[PDB]
Amino acid sequence: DDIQFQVVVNHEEQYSIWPEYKEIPQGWRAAGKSGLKKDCLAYIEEVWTDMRPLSLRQHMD
Secondary structure, X not given: OOOOEEEEEEOOOOEEEEEOOOOOOOOEEEEEEEEOHXXXXXXXXXXXXXXXXXXXXXHHO
């Protein structure tokens, strides 16, 4: 850690980390957490508990 990351989320409500210094790629947006890698990873673990893509949840539920 020395690099600030942002947690990013796509339209399927899947999460990744992305360096703050880079432009967020098309199809992704800020998910509401910036920080060191470990803190971003902790956040994703906290919030991503149903790992089915959103469209799969919609089809199954």
